[PDB]
Amino acid sequence: KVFGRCELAAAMKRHGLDNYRGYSLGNWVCAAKFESNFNTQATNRNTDGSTDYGILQINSRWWCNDGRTPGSRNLCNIPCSALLSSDITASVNCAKKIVSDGNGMNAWVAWRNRCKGTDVQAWIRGCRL
Structure with a gap:
């Protein structure tokens, strides 16, 4: 599944990630964007195997x-x-x-x-939380 930006923010919020260990929701959404492009099926092999x-x-x-x-x-x-x-x-x-x-x-x-x-926080702008 490829999440929409706001859809993922809402799923993350519901699962307790907003301000988890002091990291606001925008941080997790930003990380997911650049790690996987919001794709749950993303895989990447590293040099160490x-x-x-x-x-x-x-x-x-x-x-x-x-x-x-x-x-x-x-x-x-x-x-x-x-x-x-x-x-x-x-x-x-x-x-x-x-x-x-x-x-x-x-x-x-x-x-x-x-x-x-x-x-x-720009990563969660416009979203119905």
């Missing part, structure tokens, strides 16, 4: 099991394929664990490079 999955491009090296990343952790206790569903619940719940890790949203390279220090 790990793969990023779904709307927030969650990585198989630490966070999910895809059965093909030797010596990896499964810290969110889910198959990576569960991150590709049109229902964003598993992605949101895993993201909450990631952002509580100590490094905040800096764990998302695209957030750090393209969202951090920008007017992130």
